[PDB]
Write a protein that binds this ligand. Structure first.
Ligand SMILES: Nc1ncnc2c1ncn2[C@@H]1O[C@H](COP(=O)(O)OP(=O)(O)O)[C@@H](O)[C@H]1O
Ligand code: BEF
Lengths: 97, 78, 855, 103, 95, 97, 87, 105, 93
DNA sequence: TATGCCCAGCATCGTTAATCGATGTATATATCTGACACGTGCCTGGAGACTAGGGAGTAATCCCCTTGGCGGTTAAAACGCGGGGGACAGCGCGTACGTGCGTTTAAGCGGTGCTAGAGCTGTCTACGACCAATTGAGCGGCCTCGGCACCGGGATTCTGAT
DNA sequence: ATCAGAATCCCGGTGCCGAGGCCGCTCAATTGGTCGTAGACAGCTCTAGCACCGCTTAAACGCACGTACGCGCTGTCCCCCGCGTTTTAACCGCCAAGGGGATTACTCCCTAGTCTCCAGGCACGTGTCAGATATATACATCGATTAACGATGCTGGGCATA
């Protein structure tokens, strides 16, 4: 059959809210951070735990700021997020330079 | 390697955030948000690393850089 | 500029129930409405359907609503009593008394002739009304002001005639004149007579004024310190020729008192004070100088203390020479804005009239020393030497005249204290506050005599159930001062005395306002909240001999602020206001000279509290009780015009010099130049006749010589020769020249106009003074009718001929600038500059009237 | 030892050396490490207590960091104290808005 | 070998005093270690700046007391003052 | 007189208040309120003349910035009139809730 | 009447045009109605903490008089750096 | 010379900040070029701040420096606003920022 | 009580860029408390950083990296240039 | 006696010239305030000068913690298609909000009685840091086994569409 | 109201690896004593705040009027979604490997401590120079007024003719 679009996202929320692991892989993120840090400064070596530190530390901001974006969407009587919601959250929080 | 962050990654981050339906051109700017919020932390990591007279990024410098900006992190030393 | 509704005056019915609504107020009642931008004399009885939509309508709606509630409180209420009728009906006559004072003028500020819509120009006066600020000063034409209050018009002309401008003032700054200590009184006190210590104080102020020094008048409150200031200023202006502006700072409460006393004792001097806020400041600025990039039309004014700090640029840009201040206790500290503000005004001499205790702090006496003399200058053992030198050092610069020399006409003085004990409410409010419950430091001192000062205090005493007698019963028994105050008040009511209550706390005055109103005691409060328009009505109502207000409440600073009470005799003080001699000066507002039935004072001392320590500290600070003969061209021409305007100037020369035309010279020189001008004029006329007659004889000889050749036949009759002695003789008869002579450079001076001017003006002075000396407005001519007018655009009868000579009798010939502005003649629209009434065209008519009366 | 005499569990001499070697003040007090050890013992008893209850909410013996996250984020004063704190290997509270329910 | 310092056998005592039948993983063990070190850093720095503002050369018990009162939200501060002053009182009353 | 355009006068007041360097909240109500709250919190307290200025300007700091972020919430919400949900969202994104 | 003057609560000192001018400086065209009532609560929450810290710093300094430096320290502790009055 | 401020070629006192490091209780031992370096950095900071304050005083035709010139001088710069993020200058103001959608159209 | 305040040390720097402008007292307190606050930030950052790497002293490199951290770029670059120029000027003399 | 004719008589209009006064413009002088530089006087921290020793710079060593590749496979990632609830353009509209108005009220500019309190200089005593000695706990390193991780199978639990 | 269907939870089974605990041993905390000293205590010397008092004078609010904007509703456009189909590379684990972080030893250097003055800095009186404000004196230009002069116009007071 055809399930209702949207509720599968809700049960995915129920499944992800109980997980205690990361979501983004470690090799693409390791090549991205290693490439940006390599272009910023040549000859650098990082720690294996630092990948997890920047990993979950980046996920914390990408979850809190994304939740504030979701609340900005709900405030506008809509469910689909927009870039002006993220820019609004960054402008109100004050971190937007 | 900006293409490493695929769509299902930002999708799972959206489900963990609590969104029922997202848009389209959202992860493209989200990679920019993570890039701006990442280049300063990595810059601080290279600063504390280079100032230590050694070329090795450990784990305590990341905790010092995150706690300096106002985002304390536990577990990986402190 | 709009013609809208301002305020509401009176109300009545229009067409000759339980509650009349707004419709009954429209079709059943007419209301007297005062319009804005217009005087109170144009009040019309209008409603709503007679004026339509006009600017401002909610004021009449609220007033009509209060009138509906009033009607519900007169006879449409079963709960009304008897005193409520006298109160609600008393408000009617109260508002009537507050509205009838706006119809009578009080002063004429300016007088500028404005044009109308028909081309004419009428002289309108800037009228100032009674019991009103300088604002709302409307322009009223001179056609009805002289028919209502001629005293203001005559006095307004007297302010312009009595030229007391500062340019005539003497300049003795380089050398002071010879001073003589007088003993009698000058003929300027029109109010009443003075004793001996008043003239002694005037001789002291003028005695020290001649030495270029300043003193402090520290006499007793009531010895006429205000009258001595006005008499000293008047005698200094009219004696030493010091007509310059003198600033006298007076508090706002005492300003109307100083105005009434100033006009009652010295009516010849104006008293334009300084009040208001915004528009009144524009009135004082437009009255101060003329609209040009320096016309001093004032000299003596009254400025409040706050008006100094608010306006320092306006008062600081004007030069002054004398400064007087009443109640100069504000300069207690030398680090105040008023102390440095008064020192900014470039003055010459100062005078401090006060009785402040200069013994509790050395900074007060020293402040009064360096305040007027910049440059001059602890332990108890060295105090006898410090006062042994400073005492006699300051004695020649102070007046210490005690009241022991004036007790021969004053009643006895007495005072009795009363140690009032506390009650249970004062015990719980005196002990339970500094423990646990609250329900800092000064609140205990304020609550040491009356508990009702917070919120949870009235319901705590009332242990039962709205009642009225139980509330007052629980209110009087809460403190001993209320029971003893009611018992002593009843005792004084069994005989008949005027009792006063001086309190520091402003809330206790309202508590007495709620306690004395229930007992049926008619009174009126006096604190620092109501404006001058209300407290002046209250004080003017208390001074009546038939006033039913035997209780009059005051305050500390507002109670002892100023003025005085003559009918009051009993002074009851709740507690000392934390200041020595503040009680002496507070009783000084009632205990005065005019009081005859003695003065009884009761001090409600709080026993076993905290006020007795302050009283002892006040007693500790009380035991210490320690070219002239040179006439230039402008003077010859100006003197010649003075002869053309006044004629003989050997009798009123003092009035013809102080006007600002003749410079300060010797009168003998004016007499000699006058005798030489008149003598040379008569001699020049005599020589003009002796030579003119000879010229006429020569023209008769030549004329006969021409006729001898004319009657013979040697002259052709076809053309008449115009160049013959006959034509020049005929033109000599109608000659167009006058007796001219050059006197000391000045050319074009006629001698016939001087002699004929002295004859005409002398015949006018003898004619008017020989029939009507004290009433020039009743002079007539009889049946002497001159020739009619020669095509004039205005009606002219015999009354215009009789009133026309009055202007020449008062101002003189050629002074048409004051005749056209004189409302006592009626020729307002009959004198102009196209037009028929000219300057010389009417002057020659006046000369024809004088020549007609002489013949 | 001063830890046994003070009646606490956290050390006193070692944290006292941390007050000396940490380079904070010129002098040190006498009852400062005992008071600080008592406060840290109270915070430890509260955090480990709510962590034990959160461990019993899911029928688990050994406490996991997720029990710390659910134990701190569920309280009000603890959430106000640890505002900008991210617990390692944690998560979020099951908070779903009522406007997203299928109605 | 480096002998590192950590609050390992000092937290299990208080853990057994309230839960004598539970355990804790090493990850959250490091989280609690860095948590105690972080609270020690905040209280130490707060007592340092507070001791420097009043021109004081020592940090007694009142500095840590007001540092705990200002660092805690409400009732935890009162319980920390009562328990702390009780521990200092027991330490002073004894040897 | 006439009837000016509603809202333009508000912008004129903005142009007049942007150049102002003083305070807007009156001093006596602020002293009567802050002294009452502090008196109820702790008895027997004395303030300083400068502490009233510090709490005044410091209060108007977040009282103006918070109304600026609230104004951003009203602009993003396709409105022109502020709402209480703009205040709640402002305190949520700010993090001091 | 002239009997008693009850002021009720002192929270009514801040009226409508005051916060209207605050929002005028903030950059708001037209506001609503029930906004200043919650704004007083926002100032209450963002005020009782600063006052509480001021009383704590005052009591800790062996004195019962609030000065100006303790306010600057309390504001700088919460991340509200303020200059002008010392520091 | 005598004082280290004249030998280093700066204007801020070298002995003052050094004594503050000896009294502020921040390190057990101090260096040799730390107060000169910090004095130079602070000299550059106050140099740029007083420069933009001078421009913020000349753009409005003013002589003396007012705190509003410091507020408008710091808020207009990006790096200065990023450095002084959680900073509230007393006796200042805000930037005249009006949204484009708020204009009557 | 002789209080410490940076007064004459601000005029010497102001007259080098603007020898014809004034300064108010409130703004002077803003500059003084500003320099004091920056001193607390740099001294504190160098103190905690000196405590992280087990360093028992604070030289010029700690203030250098503290300046490079508290400032995003330009001010860090010019502050490092002028700072090293001042340290070199003082060491060479 | 009435009616035209001779001889004055002031006011009608216009034009010239002298005079008092207002306006505009220098021109050297006497205040006003606001200083910034100097000398008056005094406080005191930084500097002139030496140094022992403990933290810091550098060389040789350990190794182990981090780098760079290698087959397979597994869940993970990208495209696509009909589509259905979500987003957006647009009108009705009515009650709350902006705009004037009058009156009372409280905020503001100075004063004013003290008075509990801030700073500190007399005074020293318990408070605080350093040095021997020892000794018992903290932690380095390795063994056990059970709470928990993970998969297969049976309930089970909403759930979309009829 | 209802029924087969994907997820989801519970029971049963296997099985897995790291904290608890044991052995030990290292070394910093514990007493005990000595030497250096910080600030608590009362009161001297002030000191701004505790309350209000005089006295304004602009604002807050109830009142009345207009009006307009987001909620509600209508209608239309749309954009990822459930699910099926077609790629796709990270990683469990294994393997080689390599060089810089950490350790220990040798050396070194520079600095807090101490002994011992001196002009920088703080407060304030004194002083002539920027600007700003009149101020006595003089010169040039009218505004308006008044005295003087050219020419009468009827009007009044008398002189030769109907
Ligand atoms: N020369 C005088 N002759 C008669 N009465 C006088 C004289 N001077 C003053 N008074 C009386 O003094 C009263 C005015 O008091 P006043 O002296 O003005 O009070 P203050 O103490 O303010 O000067 C008047 O009522 C008047 O009767
Ligand atoms: F003594 Be007076 F009435 F001023």
């Amino acid at each position: 059959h055809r399930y209702r679009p949207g509720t599968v996202a809700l049960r995915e929320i129920r499944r992800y809210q109980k997980s205690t692991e990361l979501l983004i892989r470690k090799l693409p993120f390791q090549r991205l951070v290693r490439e940006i840090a390599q272009d910023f400064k040549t000859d650098l070596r990082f720690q294996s735990s630092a990948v997890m530190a920047l990993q979950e530390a980046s996920e914390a901001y990408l979850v809190a700021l994304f939740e504030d974006t979701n609340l900005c969407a709900i405030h506008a009587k809509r469910v689909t997020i927009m870039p002006k919601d993220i820019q609004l959250a960054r402008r109100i929080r004050g971190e937007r330079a | 390697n900006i293409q490493g962050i695929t769509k299902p990654a930002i999708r799972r981050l959206a489900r963990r955030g609590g969104v029922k339906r997202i848009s389209g051109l959202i992860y493209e700017e989200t990679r920019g948000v993570l890039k701006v919020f990442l280049e300063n932390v990595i810059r601080d990591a290279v600063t504390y690393t280079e100032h230590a007279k050694r070329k090795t990024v450990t784990a305590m410098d990341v905790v010092y850089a995150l706690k300096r900006q106002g985002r304390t992190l536990y577990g990986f030393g402190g | 500029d709009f013609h809208g509704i301002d305020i509401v005056i009176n109300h009545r019915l229009k067409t000759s129930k339980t509650v009349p609504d707004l419709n009954n107020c429209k079709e059943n009642y007419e209301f007297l409405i005062k319009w804005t931008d217009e005087s109170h004399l144009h009040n019309t009885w209008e409603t709503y359907e007679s004026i339509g939509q006009v600017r401002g309508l909610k004021r009449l709606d609220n007033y009509c609503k209060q009138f509906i509630i009033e009607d519900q409180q007169v006879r449409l209420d079963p709960y009304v009593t008897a005193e409520d009728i006298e109160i609600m009906d008393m408000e009617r006559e109260r508002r009537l008394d507050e509205f009838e004072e706006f119809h009578v003028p009080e002063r004429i500020i300016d007088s500028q002739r404005a044009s109308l819509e028909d081309g004419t120009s009428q002289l309108q006066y800037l009228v100032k009304w009674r019991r009103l600020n300088y604002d709302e000063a409307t322009w009223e034409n001179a056609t009805d002001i002289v028919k209502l209050a001629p005293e203001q018009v005559k006095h307004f002309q007297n302010r312009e005639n009595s030229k007391i401008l500062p340019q005539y003032s003497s300049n003795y700054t380089s050398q002071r004149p010879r001073f003589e200590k007088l003993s009698v009184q000058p003929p300027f006190i029109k109010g009443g007579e003075l004793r001996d210590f008043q003239l002694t104080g005037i001789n002291w102020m003028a005695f020290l004024w001649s030495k270029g020094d300043n003193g402090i008048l520290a006499d007793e409150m009531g010895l006429g310190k205000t009258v001595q200031t006005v008499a000293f200023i008047s005698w200094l202006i009219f004696a030493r020729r010091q007509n310059g502006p003198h600033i006298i700072v007076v508090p706002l409460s005492t300003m109307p008192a100083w105005l009434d006393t100033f006009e009652k004792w010295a009516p010849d001097l104006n008293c334009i004070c300084y009040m208001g806020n915004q528009k009144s400041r524009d009135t004082i600025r437009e009255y101060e100088f003329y609209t040009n990039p320096k016309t001093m039309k004032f000299n003596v004014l009254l400025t409040t203390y706050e008006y100094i700090l608010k306006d320092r640029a306006e008062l600081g840009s004007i030069k002054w020479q004398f400064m007087a201040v009443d109640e100069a206790h504000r300069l207690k500290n030398a680090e105040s804005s008023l102390y440095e503000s008064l020192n900014s005004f470039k003055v010459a001499n100062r005078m401090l009239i006060t009785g402040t205790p200069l013994q509790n702090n050395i900074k007060e006496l020293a402040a009064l020393v360096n305040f007027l003399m910049p440059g001059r200058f602890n332990q108890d053992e060295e105090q006898e030497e410090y006062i042994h030198d400073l005492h006699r050092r300051i004695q020649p610069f102070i007046l210490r005249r005690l009241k022991k020399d004036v007790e021969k006409s004053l009643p006895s003085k007495t005072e009795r204290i009363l140690r009032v004990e506390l009650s249970d409410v004062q015990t719980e409010y005196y002990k339970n506050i500094l423990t646990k419950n609250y329900s800092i430091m000064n609140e205990l001192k304020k609550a040491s005599n009356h508990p009702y000062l917070f919120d949870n205090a009235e319901e705590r005493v009332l242990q039962k159930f709205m009642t009225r007698e139980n509330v007052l019963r629980g209110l009087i028994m809460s403190s001993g001062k209320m029971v003893l105050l009611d018992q002593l008040l009843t005792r004084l009511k069994k005989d008949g005395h005027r009792v006063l209550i001086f309190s520091q706390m402003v809330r206790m005055l309202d508590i007495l306002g709620d306690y004395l109103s229930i007992k049926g005691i008619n009174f009126q409060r006096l604190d620092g909240t109501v404006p001058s328009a209300q407290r002046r009505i209250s004080i003017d109502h208390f001074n009546s001999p038939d006033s039913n207000d035997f209780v009059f409440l005051l305050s500390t600073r507002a109670g002892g602020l100023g003025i005085n009470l003559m009918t009051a005799d009993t002074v009851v003080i709740f507690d000392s206001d934390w200041n020595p001699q503040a009680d002496l000066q507070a009783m000084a507002r009632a205990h005065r000279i005019g009081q005859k039935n003695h003065v009884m004072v009761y001090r409600l001392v709080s026993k076993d509290t905290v006020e007795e320590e302050v009283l002892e500290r006040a007693r500790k600070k009380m035991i210490l009780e320690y070219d002239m003969d040179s006439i230039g061209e402008s003077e010859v021409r100006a003197l010649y015009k003075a002869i053309l305007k006044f004629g003989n100037l050997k009798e009123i020369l003092d009035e013809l010099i102080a006007d600002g035309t003749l410079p300060v010279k010797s009168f003998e020189k004016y007499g000699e130049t006058y005798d030489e001008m008149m003598e040379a004029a008569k001699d020049c006329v005599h020589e003009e006749e002796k030579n003119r007659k000879e010229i006429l004889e020569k023209l008769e000889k030549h004329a006969t010589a021409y006729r001898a050749k004319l009657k013979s036949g040697e002259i052709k009759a076809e053309n008449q020769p115009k160049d013959n002695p006959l034509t020049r003789l005929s033109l000599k008869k109608r000659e167009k020249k006058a007796v001219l002579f050059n006197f000391k450079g000045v050319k074009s001076l006629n001698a016939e106009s001087l002699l004929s001017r002295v004859e005409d003006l002398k015949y006018l002075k003898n004619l008017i003074n020989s029939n009507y000396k004290d009433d020039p407005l009743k002079f007539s001519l009889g049946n002497n009718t001159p020739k009619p007018v020669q095509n004039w655009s205005s009606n002219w009868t015999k009354e215009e001929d009789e009133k026309l000579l009055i202007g020449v009798f008062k101002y003189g010939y050629g002074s048409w600038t004051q005749i056209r502005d004189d409302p006592f003649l009626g020729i307002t629209d009959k004198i102009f500059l196209k037009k028929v009434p000219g300057a010389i065209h009417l002057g020659r008519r006046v000369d024809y009237l004088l020549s007609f009366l002489r013949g | 030892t001063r830890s046994s005499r003070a009646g606490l569990q956290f050390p006193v001499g070692r944290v006292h050396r941390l007050l000396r070697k940490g380079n904070y003040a010129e002098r040190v007090g006498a009852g400062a490490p005992v008071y600080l050890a008592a406060v840290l013992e109270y915070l430890t008893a509260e955090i480990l207590e709510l962590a034990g209850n959160a461990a019993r909410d899911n029928k688990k013996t050994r406490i996991i960091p997720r029990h710390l996250q659910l134990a701190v984020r569920n309280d009000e004063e603890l959430n106000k104290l640890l505002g900008r704190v991210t617990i390692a290997q944690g998560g979020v509270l099951p908070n779903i808005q009522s406007v997203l329910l299928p109605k | 070998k480096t002998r590192k310092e950590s609050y390992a056998i000092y937290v299990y005592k208080v853990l057994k005093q309230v839960h004598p039948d539970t355990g804790i993983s090493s990850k959250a063990m490091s989280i609690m270690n860095s948590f105690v070190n972080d609270v020690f850093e905040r209280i130490a720095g707060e007592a340092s700046r507070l001791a420097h503002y009043n021109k004081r050369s020592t940090i007694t018990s009142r500095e840590i007391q007001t540092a705990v009162r200002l660092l805690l939200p409400g009732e935890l501060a009162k319980h920390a003052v009562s328990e702390g002053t009780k521990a200092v009182t027991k330490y002073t009353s004894a040897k």
